[PDB]
Amino acid sequence: EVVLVNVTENFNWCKNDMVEQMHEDICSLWDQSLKPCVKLTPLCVGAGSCNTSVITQACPKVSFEPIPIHYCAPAGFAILKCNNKTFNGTGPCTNVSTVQCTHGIRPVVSSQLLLNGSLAEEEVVIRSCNFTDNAKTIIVQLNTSVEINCTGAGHCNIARAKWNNTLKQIASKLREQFGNNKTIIFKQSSGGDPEIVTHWFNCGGEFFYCNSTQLFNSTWFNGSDTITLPCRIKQIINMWCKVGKMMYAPPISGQIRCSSNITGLLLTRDGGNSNNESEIFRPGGGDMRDNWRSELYKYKVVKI
Amino acid sequence: DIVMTQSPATLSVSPGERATLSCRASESVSSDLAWYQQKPGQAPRLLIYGASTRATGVPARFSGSGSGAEFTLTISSLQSEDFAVYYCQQYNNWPPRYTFGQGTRLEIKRTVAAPSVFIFPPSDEQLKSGTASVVCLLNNFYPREAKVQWKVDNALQSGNSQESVTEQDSKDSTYSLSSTLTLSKADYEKHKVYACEVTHQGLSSPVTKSFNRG
Amino acid sequence: EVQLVESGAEVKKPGSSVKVSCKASGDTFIRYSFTWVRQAPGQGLEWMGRIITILDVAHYAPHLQGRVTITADKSTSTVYLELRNLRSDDTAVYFCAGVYEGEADEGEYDNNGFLKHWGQGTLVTVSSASTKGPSVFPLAPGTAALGCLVKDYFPEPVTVSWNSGALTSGVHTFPAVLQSSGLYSLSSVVTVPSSSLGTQTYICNVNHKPSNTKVDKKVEP
Amino acid sequence: KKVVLGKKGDTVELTCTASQKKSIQFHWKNSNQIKILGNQGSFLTKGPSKLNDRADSRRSLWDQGNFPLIIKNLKIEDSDTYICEVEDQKEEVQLLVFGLTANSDTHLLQGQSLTLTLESPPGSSPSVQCRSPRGKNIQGGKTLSVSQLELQDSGTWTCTVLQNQKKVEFKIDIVVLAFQK
Ligand SMILES: OC[C@H]1O[C@@](CO)(O[C@H]2O[C@H](CO)[C@@H](O)[C@H](O)[C@H]2O)[C@@H](O)[C@@H]1O
Ligand SMILES: *[C@@H]1O[C@H](CO)[C@@H](O)[C@H](O)[C@H]1NC(C)=O
Ligand SMILES: *[C@@H]1O[C@H](CO)[C@@H](O)[C@H](O)[C@H]1NC(C)=O
Ligand SMILES: *[C@@H]1O[C@H](CO)[C@@H](O)[C@H](O)[C@H]1NC(C)=O
Ligand SMILES: *[C@@H]1O[C@H](CO)[C@@H](O)[C@H](O)[C@H]1NC(C)=O
Ligand SMILES: *[C@@H]1O[C@H](CO)[C@@H](O)[C@H](O)[C@H]1NC(C)=O
Ligand SMILES: *[C@@H]1O[C@H](CO)[C@@H](O)[C@H](O)[C@H]1NC(C)=O
Ligand SMILES: *[C@@H]1O[C@H](CO)[C@@H](O)[C@H](O)[C@H]1NC(C)=O
Ligand SMILES: *[C@@H]1O[C@H](CO)[C@@H](O)[C@H](O)[C@H]1NC(C)=O
Ligand SMILES: *[C@@H]1O[C@H](CO)[C@@H](O)[C@H](O)[C@H]1NC(C)=O
């Protein structure tokens, strides 16, 4: 829209107001769009007894494909955008610009895998807020999409060959970050809430939970055409906008189908004091701010 | 609230024949409808749910149908253990405000049988305690509908008696009925003759057993 | 397959409160939802409320709202019903029931509204009357009729047998009625051959457990 | 220099407090930087640690700024130093687990011996002091033993383990049989 020259701008994608603002707008939307039969939130104000707050309401079944949402500048501010084909989110960017709104973003709620997102324009790209810290999330962005086909009848499908090529590119990128002599190893999730241990996502209004062990079980730099993930649909859900629980009614349709493109991943690295040289990576996620950061890394909002 | 209403109140079926019960709702409840069976002194028993699904242990001769605001339950060939009270339930609304119909009593249909009428004056022991009750018994009759009336010295009585009725007898399919007139020692001795006039389909003329004090 | 077993009969003054219980055994407790349904003498079934055991959330009928509470103790597989500010019209048999909802501990929950497993029922009588035993009077006599008038007792139930159980043929024990005095009353009659009067004796046996009373009245020609 | 003592098979709660009353990111680690447990948004994660199965938190307090590490069914192996990372700041707490058992399982006769044996993490000298129901006092390091039991020793013994100026109490039921003359 409006380009700039002879101007340097320091970005910091791990300290971005747009990410927080978007997180609330999204919550508000899901909150009001898909309503639970019962809502449970903890309330422990009193020093002693804890009081669970309960809400019961009419819960109509609803399903439609999330419409792209845009972020636009609030009165007083402006949106700068970095145009470097491969920008890591931090430091100066001279190929900068100012825009009305951001690009169209699908407000997808999911873990482990990022769906229907933006692709890297050149090579596969990995990004973190602190790589040496094994607790911080590693966001992968792919340069090629991978289909994942899911059905309410209990499974998801991925082509093995396509997924294997993808793993090769991530491992390649990973070992470049942690030492060119390291062995890259993908393992299943190590534990936690169901929404975190499985590849969790929403589809036709129903919450799916898919065992992703088969996607994360290989060793790099040391047979069956499609990979079929077992899945469950669930009625009792852990909240993601805050701490609590939600119950929905059982499905009313017998033909729930989701085709999606895997455009990125969320990983966590094992780490830990080990003179043995090999890094272990497991699927991660849970904080949707990471999901939003993978789309907004190239934006910042500045006062006019 | 959603009102459930069953028809009819009482249904008389001859053994081995088909019976049809209906349940109606004041608004659509989809297929969230269940039928229960209950026998005197026992808990209810689930028969059908989802409008038309038999519960475990339920025999094939039971079957339910319908959706929305209209439901029926069919027993294709009544056995002895099929005669009971049947209840329908809706559980469609949310928040849950589930409701039941007032039930349909399903009893055995037999030939008309006249009651044999008896009458027991108050006992000495009772009279000695200040009170006096007179009992009029209608034994082994069908159908259930009977009309009793107390007359004290050729005078209609009102509000001073009570009725009790047994369940349909498992062997002969009849009913029995007791009617107790209650008076004080003083009122009792104020009059002469005590009678119970009895009307029943099995009687051409209303029958009257009686007695005189002393 | 769960078995539901409720606590014993209760007797309360109006204005009191009651807490009835129901022990569930045989299956995984948190996979069942439980419901309470009551029934007044000679009346139909009434849904009182339902607890979602795994979430610990309960819902109640509008006309009970405010004076009824259902809870669940996971450590002993027990479900409780509390009814506050009791009235005489709360007199009823109170039933505990439940149904399987699925692999709830894994997030599967069907939310079934129907009731598959029932307890034996708990009679709760709400009255101003006091506990007291029946007075037993004779109903002195084809064939002939004879019986026992069981009058003025509280509360239900009362049991009647003849000749210590040896006489059962042709016996009718009527259901109780509520007298205007607030006390119960019933008659038990039996029909025997006329020639049996003068040779075979007839004693009626009245047991009323609440007052720990027991009477054997002889009926004679 | 925060020290907490644990008991074999028991449960402990290692506390963590944020300077504000909100729910932010936190993570528990051990001295080897192995991830034990932390959060991601409103969900709980668990690392590839030997504790995985037996580790938990209390999410009904996260919004109150409390992020505890509950370890159930404690083992001696669990002994380590645990670090709570939150809002760019490290809370450090050391955990020592002890166990205390008798030489035999079954009942003892009068005049028979009793040996209590204390189990400990490598590198740590604790003092032990046990007292019988009659007042019999014994002390030592690894192993404590009474040469001759009296009938009056039957009942609950109370042992106290001293370490890092902190203590913790154990209760053991010894039965000593009576007999006819
Ligand atoms: O809660 C009252 C509500 O229940 C209904 C139907 O379930 O009637 C039930 O409760 C009545 C109140 O005692 C009983 O008399 C009746 O037999 C029973 O079915 C509705 O009538 C009412 O709205
Ligand atoms: C981000 O890219 C910049 C280029 O400006 C590079 O210098 C830097 O290494 C990258 N980020 C960091 C701090 O690792
Ligand atoms: C994707 O990026 C990888 C490097 O990680 C590169 O080798 C490959 O050619 C890229 N694919 C496309 C289509 O650009
Ligand atoms: C990244 O994490 C490591 C250890 O977890 C820490 O030492 C380092 O300071 C962190 N990076 C920054 C600059 O915050
Ligand atoms: C997923 O579905 C698409 C069409 O929507 C199909 O072309 C693709 O091959 C499928 N991939 C599988 C089955 O893994
Ligand atoms: C990736 O998996 C494929 C299965 O299609 C298999 O050929 C191979 O083991 C893997 N790739 C490489 C480079 O070995
Ligand atoms: C996923 O499947 C693998 C093998 O089928 C199993 O070992 C693992 O426990 C499963 N994960 C979950 C979340 O159950
Ligand atoms: C990965 O999967 C294979 C079977 O496909 C299994 O044999 C192997 O044990 C798994 N790897 C591990 C050790 O997690
Ligand atoms: C996935 O990616 C392919 C290739 O670009 C695209 O044509 C297809 O429509 C995508 N599938 C879905 C369901 O978005
Ligand atoms: C991804 O986009 C496809 C294409 O319309 C849509 O069908 C699918 O529902 C989307 N997946 C999710 C989880 O939103």
C141/C102 same-domain check: no
Which domains are present in chain A? 1-304 (2.170.40.20)
Please give the DSSP secondary-structure letter assigned to residue B142.
B
Q: Say if residues B196 and B118 touch (Cβ distance below 8 Å).
A: no
Phi, psi of A112 (to 5 degrees): 65, -50
Q: Give the burial class of C87: count Cβ atoms within 10 A of its Cβ; 0-12 exposed, 13-18 middle, 19 or more buried.
A: exposed
Strand partners, D147: none
Going from the C-alpha of A56 to that of each of B29, B95, C85, the distances in angstroms are 20, 7, 26
* Helix (H), strand (E) at residue B125: helix B124-127
Angle value at C-alpha A98, between A92 and A99, nearest 5 degrees? 135
Residue D18 token pair: 């944020």
B205/B125 same-domain check: yes
Q: What is the CATH number of the domain that holds D151?
A: 2.60.40.10
Residue A16 token pair: 């971005």
Rounded to whole angstroms, the Cα distance separating A52 from A90 reads 42
Residue B51 token pair: 């409008």
B87/B122 same-domain check: no
D43/D104 same-domain check: no
D121/D83 same-domain check: no
Choose one of B85, B110, B135: the last residue of a domain: B110
Per CB-CB distance under 8 Å, the chain C contacts of B163 are 177
Rounded to whole angstroms, the Cα distance separating A248 from A37 reads 5
Residue D73 token pair: 């069914």
Per CB-CB distance under 8 Å, the chain C contacts of B30 are none
10 Å Cβ neighbour count for D47?
Answer: 26
Q: At what angle do helices A17-33 and A288-296 cross, to 10 degrees?
A: 120
Three-state SS for D111? coil
Specify the number of domains making up chain C: 2
Per CB-CB distance under 8 Å, the chain A contacts of B94 are 37, 58-59, 249
Pairing between strand C18-25 and C3-6? Answer: antiparallel
What is the 3 state secondary structure string of chain A? CEECCCCCEEEECCCCHHHHHHHHHHHHHHHHHCCCCEEEECCCCCCCCCCCEEEECCCCCCCCCCCCECCECCCCEEEEEECCCCCCCEEEECCEEEECECCCECCCCECCEEECCCCCCCCCEEEECCCCCCCCCEEEEEEEEEEEEEECCCEEEEEHHHHHHHHHHHHHHHHHHHCCCCEEEECCCCCECHHHHCEEEEECCEEEEECCHHHCCEEECCCCCEEEEEEEEECEEECCCCCCEEECCCCCCCCCEEEEEEEEEEEEECCCCCCCCEEEEEECCCCHHHHHHHHHCCEEEEEC
C111/C4 same-domain check: yes
Strand partners, C191: C145
10 Å Cβ neighbour count for B111?
Answer: 8
Going from the C-alpha of A267 to that of each of A135, A144, A187, A281, the distances in angstroms are 10, 18, 11, 6
D149/D80 same-domain check: no
Method for this entry: X-ray
Q: Say if residues A149 and A258 touch (Cβ distance below 8 Å).
A: yes
Q: Which domain holds residue D68?
A: 1-98
Q: Give the burial class of A148: count Cβ atoms within 10 A of its Cβ; 0-12 exposed, 13-18 middle, 19 or more buried.
A: buried
Q: Please, how many CA atoms are within 13 Å of residue A217, restricted to the half-sphere of its CB?
A: 8
Candidates A82, A88, A178: which one to mutate for ligand 2, based on the most atoms within 8 Å of Cβ?
A88
Phi, psi of D95 (to 5 degrees): -120, 125
Among the residues of chain D, which ranges form H helices? none
Please give the DSSP secondary-structure letter assigned to residue B171.
T
Whose CA is closest to A249, among C116, C112, C48? C112
Residue D44 token pair: 């709980």
Choose one of D76, D98, D120: the last residue of a domain: D98
Phi, psi of C133 (to 5 degrees): -80, 160
Three-state SS for D74? coil
Mention every residue, 6+ apart, whose C-beta is less than 8 A from residue D1.
none
Q: Which domain holds residue C204?
A: 129-221
- Angstroms from B46 CA to nearest CA on chain C: 6
Go through chain C and tell me how many residues it has: 221
Rounded to whole angstroms, the Cα distance separating B116 from B137 reads 8
Rounded to whole angstroms, the Cα distance separating A247 from A294 reads 30
Pairing between strand D90-102 and D2-7? Answer: parallel
CA-CA-CA-CA torsion sign (A24, A28, A30, A36)? positive
Residue D135 token pair: 């007042």
Whose CA is closest to A18, among A93, A127, A86, A99? A99
> DSSP of chain C, one letter per residue?
--EEEEPPPEEE-TT--EEEEEEEESS-GGGEEEEEEEE-TT--EEEEEEEETTTTEEEE-TTTTTSEEEEEEGGGTEEEEEE-S--GGG-EEEEEEEEE--SGGGT------S--EE---EEEEE-S---BPPEEEEE---EEEEEEEEEEEBSS--EEEEGGGTB-TTEEEPPPEE-TTS-EEEEEEEEEEGGGTTTS-EEEEEEEGGGTEEEEEEE--
B99/B117 same-domain check: no
> DSSP of D131-145, one letter per residue?
E-TT--EEEESSEEE
Mention every residue, 6+ apart, whose C-beta is less than 8 A from residue B177.
B115, B137, B138, B141, B146, B148, B163, B164, B165, B166
D21/D94 same-domain check: yes
C4/C108 same-domain check: yes
Q: Say if residues D58 and D66 touch (Cβ distance below 8 Å).
A: yes
Choose one of C87, C103, C128: the last residue of a domain: C128
Residues 67-126 on B with a CB inside 8 Å of C are 87, 89-92, 95-103, 116, 118, 120, 122-123, 125-126
D61/D88 same-domain check: yes
Mention every residue, 6+ apart, whose C-beta is less than 8 A from residue A80.
A9, A96, A97, A98, A99, A299, A300, A301, A302
Q: What is the CATH number of the domain that holds C218?
A: 2.60.40.10
Q: Say if residues A245 and A236 touch (Cβ distance below 8 Å).
A: yes
Rounded to whole angstroms, the Cα distance separating C48 from C50 reads 7
D155/D68 same-domain check: no
Rounded to whole angstroms, the Cα distance separating A143 from A265 reads 12
Mention every residue, 6+ apart, whose C-beta is less than 8 A from residue D105.
none
Residue A277's identity, in one-letter code, is E
Nominal resolution in Å? 2.5
CB contact under 8 A, A38 and C56: no
CB contact under 8 A, D29 and A135: yes
B7/B46 same-domain check: yes
Going from the C-alpha of A109 to that of each of A205, A246, B61, the distances in angstroms are 11, 15, 50
Strand partners, C24: C4
Q: Which ligand is nearest to the CA of A142?
A: 3
Say if residue B95 is preceded by a cis peptide, omega within 30 of 0. yes
Rounded to whole angstroms, the Cα distance separating B101 from D6 reads 61
B35/B73 same-domain check: yes
Whose CA is closest to A298, among A176, A135, A141, A134? A141
Rounded to whole angstroms, the Cα distance separating D135 from D29 reads 43
Three-state SS for D78? helix
C97/C164 same-domain check: no
Residue C39 token pair: 């029934």
Rounded to whole angstroms, the Cα distance separating B209 from B198 reads 9
Provide the b/e sequence for B128-158 (b: ≥16 CB within 10 Å): eeebbbbbbbbbbbbbbebebbbebeeeeee
Torsion of CA C2, C7, C13, C18, to 10 degrees: -50
Whose CA is closest to B183, among B140, B132, B124? B132
Choose one of D41, D72, D98: the last residue of a domain: D98
Rounded to whole angstroms, the Cα distance separating C102 from C33 reads 10
* Helix (H), strand (E) at residue B165: strand B161-165
Candidates A210, A211, A215, A217: which one to mutate for ligand 7, based on the most atoms within 8 Å of Cβ?
A211
Specify the number of domains making up chain D: 2
Q: Say if residues A176 and A198 touch (Cβ distance below 8 Å).
A: no
Rounded to whole angstroms, the Cα distance separating A221 from A183 reads 6
Choose one of D63, D98, D133: the last residue of a domain: D98
Rounded to whole angstroms, the Cα distance separating A88 from A105 reads 19
Mention every residue, 6+ apart, whose C-beta is less than 8 A from residue A158.
A146, A147, A148, A149, A215, A226, A227, A229, A262
C84/C145 same-domain check: no
Residue B180's identity, in one-letter code, is T
Q: Say if residues D123 and D103 touch (Cβ distance below 8 Å).
A: no
Pairing between strand A183-186 and A278-283? Answer: parallel
* Strand order, beta sheet including A245-247: A53-56, A38-41, A245-247, A236-238
Q: Say if residues A240 and D41 touch (Cβ distance below 8 Å).
A: yes
Q: Which ligand is nearest to the CA of A160?
A: 6
Residue C62 token pair: 């509008």
Residue D180 falls inside a structural domain: no
B59/B139 same-domain check: no
Q: Say if residues A284 and A270 touch (Cβ distance below 8 Å).
A: no
CB contact under 8 A, A238 and D43: yes
Rounded to whole angstroms, the Cα distance separating C68 from C53 reads 17
Q: Is A191 left (phi over 0), alpha (psi -120 to 50) or beta?
A: left
Angle value at C-alpha A255, between A253 and A260, nearest 5 degrees? 120
* Helix (H), strand (E) at residue D83: strand D80-86
C7/C107 same-domain check: yes
Angle value at C-alpha C65, between C62 and C67, nearest 5 degrees? 150
Tell the residue number behind the tokens 């996979």, with chain if given. Answer: C31
B38/B10 same-domain check: yes
B137/B75 same-domain check: no
Q: Say if residues B162 and B203 touch (Cβ distance below 8 Å).
A: no
Q: Give the burial class of D153: count Cβ atoms within 10 A of its Cβ; 0-12 exposed, 13-18 middle, 19 or more buried.
A: buried
What is the chain B residue with the closest CA to C178?
B162
* Strand order, beta sheet including C213-219: C159-162, C202-208, C213-219
* Helix (H), strand (E) at residue B183: strand B175-184
C41/C118 same-domain check: yes
Go through chain B and tell me how many residues it has: 214
Please give the DSSP secondary-structure letter assigned to residue D42.
T
Three-state SS for B176? strand
Residue C186's identity, in one-letter code, is L
Mention every residue, 6+ apart, whose C-beta is less than 8 A from residue B197.
B148, B149, B150, B151, B206, B207, B208
Whose CA is closest to A262, among A154, A149, A151, A186? A149
Q: Say if residues D115 and D144 touch (Cβ distance below 8 Å).
A: yes
D50/D82 same-domain check: yes
Per CB-CB distance under 8 Å, the chain B contacts of C50 are 96, 98
What is the chain C residue with the closest CA to A252?
C110
D63/D90 same-domain check: yes
Among B31, B91, B94, B97, which would you mutate to test the A interface (most chain A Cβ atoms within 10 Å of its Cβ)?
A: B94
Q: Say if residues C73 and C82 touch (Cβ distance below 8 Å).
A: no
Whose CA is closest to A145, among A259, A277, A294? A259
Q: Give the burial class of D107: count Cβ atoms within 10 A of its Cβ; 0-12 exposed, 13-18 middle, 19 or more buried.
A: exposed
Rounded to whole angstroms, the Cα distance separating C73 from C24 reads 11
Tell the residue number behind the tokens 């499609």, with chain if given. Answer: A226
D20/D35 same-domain check: yes
Angle value at C-alpha C119, between C118 and C120, nearest 5 degrees? 120
Whose CA is closest to A269, among C12, D48, D110? D48
Widest CA span of chain B, in angstroms? 68
Residue D121 falls inside a structural domain: yes
C124/C180 same-domain check: no
Strand partners, C72: C79
Going from the C-alpha of A12 to that of each of A129, A134, A138, the distances in angstroms are 10, 20, 16
Q: Say if residues B147 and B198 touch (Cβ distance below 8 Å).
A: yes
CB contact under 8 A, A232 and C107: yes
* Helix (H), strand (E) at residue B189: helix B185-190
Q: Say if residues C187 and C140 touch (Cβ distance below 8 Å).
A: no
Q: What is the CATH number of the domain that holds B91?
A: 2.60.40.10
Among C53, C56, C69, C111, which would you mutate to test the A interface (most chain A Cβ atoms within 10 Å of its Cβ)?
A: C111
Choose one of C83, C105, C128: the last residue of a domain: C128
Residue B157 token pair: 């009585």
D88/D2 same-domain check: yes
Rounded to whole angstroms, the Cα distance separating A288 from A275 reads 34
In angstroms and rounded to an integer, the radius of gyration of the C-alpha atoms of chain D is 21
D152/D167 same-domain check: yes
Whose CA is closest to C148, among C131, C132, C129, C167? C167
CB contact under 8 A, A38 and C57: yes
Going from the C-alpha of B200 to that of each of A210, B19, B108, B113, B154, the distances in angstroms are 72, 26, 18, 9, 21
D9/D47 same-domain check: yes
Rounded to whole angstroms, the Cα distance separating D66 from D84 reads 11
Q: Give the burial class of C212: count Cβ atoms within 10 A of its Cβ; 0-12 exposed, 13-18 middle, 19 or more buried.
A: exposed
Residue D179 falls inside a structural domain: no
Pairing between strand B116-120 and B131-141? Answer: antiparallel
C111/C189 same-domain check: no
10 Å Cβ neighbour count for A115?
Answer: 20
Q: Which domain holds residue B208?
A: 111-213
Q: Is A226 in the pocket of ligand 5 (CB under 6 A)?
A: yes
Choose one of C86, C108, C128: the last residue of a domain: C128
Tell the residue number behind the tokens 């009772």, with chain if given. Answer: B126
C7/C85 same-domain check: yes
Q: Give the burial class of B206: count Cβ atoms within 10 A of its Cβ; 0-12 exposed, 13-18 middle, 19 or more buried.
A: exposed
Residue A55 token pair: 């809400």
C150/C110 same-domain check: no
Residue C181 token pair: 């005095």
Per CB-CB distance under 8 Å, the chain C contacts of A54 are 57
How many angstroms separate the first and last alpha carbons of chain A?
17
* Helix (H), strand (E) at residue B198: strand B193-200
10 Å Cβ neighbour count for B69?
Answer: 16
Choose one of B81, B110, B139: the last residue of a domain: B110
Phi, psi of A19 (to 5 degrees): -65, -40
